[PDB]
Subunit: 260 residues, 4 copies
């Protein structure tokens, strides 16, 4: 499953990853759901170790094109995981208070504490994504941010954070269908804003911004994983597999008279 | 079912509530687990609505004697509920930073935002519970806090927060059993604190504190519910039933705001 | 003196206070500057004691019509007072993050800690002032906020905060000059916004809103002081006098071997 | 006066700086007080411009041995500077909440916003000073923090923060005198705690930690200035001079009318 980890060699090409690829799983939807159920139970048990051990900090970063599966991933991968140990931090349009400090200030506040698993639904990456695509700052400014990010993540990792960054990779046609389904669904119509169409006109610019971001910031201490995400069953299984394998590697353990 | 809601008449008596009572459910463990499963799936759907609508703020307060079932309630009642819309805020021993401001400062920071459901695992109530029982401040100080709490909760309710306060009611013997079990299971021995034996010695002073707190702060806008909690199946079913009924009462609606090329 | 303290009898009338009144000081500008210098030194010494003792919390609330003297007051009254123990919290246009919680959430965060003196340059009062005048919430909502404020302040006072609320009272004509002077001064033009003309146009609505807010919230534990503020020398002297006397009343004490 | 700026060449030696040196000022205490009053007035005007312009963020870091003059510097250098635009963030013993996140979390929280001047009375540097001296984390951990600090400061500078870091340099004998004076003055005894004496026993370890920290983190974007601080008048004048010169270099402008 190591074929999805982006090596720190600055030679990453997004074209080498197909959103419709399901090659790491030897079967289809039904076999994958059973396999996911097994991983989800292991994940619940690994989160229990993390929380009780209270040493490690786990950071899961989710990034994708609009309708790329960020909410779906959280919902399904973390299903049944103790709410006391799992937290979501969503990053939207910066406020005036947030813009008055460096772009990393609002992000650094939300980092996981010891024994905690945090999911960034969007992140500090938006500052080299939407900011780059829509030229919210000049190139001279945002080009320097790749180093800021590598060094911020190095500090986090050195200080005890396990970082997993998932790029949920969907195709242009898959986004068109998901966006259309969001229009033609009254319980999902709320997720759709008009702005989702302008970001859609900028598809290629966003793909280029993603490629450069992933190429510049995938490191040994903070890897990027490209998740083919056109098939939700595959996306959910693969994210769970990578997460569970990473947590297993930490080799966490539980810590070390008659009541009247 | 809402015979468990404490009326704002200042006549609340904890003796009228039996921790072993299961009278609101016409059956036992197995039927209640099926009933809970149904409520849990309704809760998942009601949370999706709350988040989507993004107007209401939901605050669930959990208070109990040690080993009274606070963690158990969170894990079971909120099982499968989207992590993006549900948050737990735990209140422990105040830090120097927290003590340097009023007791409500650390609590007010954690309140739910619009479209969010927040669980207070312990709360601002500890400032009329452990503080009163262990005399951390004089009576002159903590007696004034019942009003502070009523008025803080009124402000929260008026400004859009739906407040549900659950007192998970267990018996003295049930506590004896639960701490003993926790002090035996090696995967749970980490939960046990030596301080739990001094708090058990003050059982009666904590029961009196709870009675006073519940009597003083159960209001129309922020009710207290006494949950008989010796039977976990009953405690989980009843908390889910009360929560689901409350969210259904909000009559939440999905927002309403072309061919993609 | 106590002639400026608004009694908690719900009979407050702003008309009884003249912005041009200087009756509490037996002299003019020059004698009051010397008197202010004496109070300012006492204030520096009282702040040093407050910080050292580290037990009391002091909250100074400043409210006024636009150009009413809030900045001028901070600058002059707190001149030379140690920056380590004096903090300003300015309340501007609420952000989306701030609006997503109750109006008191952003305000409660900024309250003074033990040994600290905090100045609210605008405050939670804006939630019964601009909010009321411009109908940012319905009357049914903001009318309930007077009680919220009394009860919030009661809690603060009961828990150890000394609360002083100053309404810097200027006349309509004094504001017209000050606003105009702000337009004509290139080192002050930045303070002017087009919205200030809308706020000037609503003078009477704001005066009504101030009268109702002062009448509803001036209590024994959190008094309002109406400061005639057309004369800056008088405004600065009177605010310093009230503050110094209040801090002296606290009877603060300093907390209580050969080096090799 | 560029003799006090630590060049980014990794060759810094604290022994080359005398706490009793006053060579940059051609006079004594009384002429310096007048000179300081002139600089203080310029500083009040530069702060007004910073706040009005609302674009730059100014970070002043103060580090010293105990009784080295951090509070005195804040009090005198920033005397009369508008409280609305100047803020002090003091860094003490980390709480359990603070220790549960990386050491930079509590520090990053306090960084200046646009139009603001912030003074760090102690800072993120403590995490390579007291932490190193008392081995609160192993060497393997704190040795990596010099890079974290350079890169955190680079990010801050690139994103619009002007950083000035002042090491207020006093001698071992000056600290003995000042610590004694603190125990004898009843309005200053509160500043003294017993721990300050074990910190004095560890004088040499702290001097080595300071030398290493300054050598590792003095950069073009975030320089360290060694301030001979045995003479308060000289320390106050020199810090004001460096600060005023730095702010003047920003060539701040009042906002363009609407
Ligand atoms: N740093 C940033 N700068 C500008 N816009 C940002 C930044 N971070 C996030 N955003 C934007 O905030 C929006 C969040 O969208 P939203 O509908 O609330 O959530 P999501 O689409 O992830 O479910 C996106 O349009 C995203 O581009
Ligand atoms: N306001 C407060 N003042 C004093 N102690 C408090 C306060 N709030 C909470 N506590 C105490 O903090 C402790 C939290 O216990 P902990 O083991 O961390 O969690 P829990 O037992 O709820 O699982 C309890 O002993 C509780 O009495
Ligand atoms: N609660 C609030 N709701 C709406 N607007 C607010 C609120 N609090 C403050 N404001 C507004 O924020 C603005 C702050 O103005 P600004 O020019 O930044 O400062 P000031 O005029 O006090 O020097 C004012 O127009 C004020 O009415
Ligand atoms: N990162 C840190 N780790 C450990 N101790 C720290 C840290 N930061 C600051 N401290 C300690 O906190 C204490 C603050 O001392 P205090 O008397 O409150 O202030 P000061 O001496 O600066 O006036 C010092 O002993 C300092 O070493
Ligand atoms: Cl699917
Ligand atoms: Mg969207
Ligand atoms: Mg204005
Ligand atoms: Mg904000
Ligand atoms: Mg000290």
């Amino acid at each position: 499953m190591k074929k999805y980890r982006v090596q720190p060699d600055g030679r990453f090409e997004l074209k080498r990853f197909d959103p419709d690829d399901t090659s790491a799983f030897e079967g289809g939807k039904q076999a994958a759901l059973e396999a996911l159920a097994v991983l989800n139970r292991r994940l619940e048990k690994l989160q229990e170790l993390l929380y009780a051990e209270g040493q490690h900090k786990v950071l899961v970063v989710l990034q994708a094109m609009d309708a790329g599966g960020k909410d779906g991933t959280i919902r399904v991968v973390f299903d049944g995981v103790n709410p006391s140990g799992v937290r979501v931090a969503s990053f939207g349009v910066p406020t005036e208070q947030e813009l008055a400090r460096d772009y990393l200030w609002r992000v650094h506040q939300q980092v996981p504490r010891k024994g905690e698993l945090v999911i960034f639904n969007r992140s500090h990456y938006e500052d080299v994504l939407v900011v780059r695509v829509k030229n919210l700052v000049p190139q001279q400014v945002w080009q320097k941010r790749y180093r800021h990010i590598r060094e911020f993540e190095r500090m986090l990792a050195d200080e005890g954070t396990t970082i997993l960054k998932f790029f949920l990779h969907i195709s242009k046609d898959e986004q068109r269908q998901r966006l259309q389904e969001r229009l033609d669904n009254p319980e999902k119509r709320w997720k759709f804003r008009m702005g989702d169409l302008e970001d859609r006109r900028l598809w290629d610019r966003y793909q280029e911004a993603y490629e450069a971001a992933i190429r510049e910031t995938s490191t040994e201490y903070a890897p990027w994983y490209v998740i083919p995400a056109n098939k939700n069953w595959y996306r959910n299984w693969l994210v769970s597999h990578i997460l569970v394998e990473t947590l297993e590697g930490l080799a966490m353990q539980y810590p070390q008279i008659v009541i009247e």
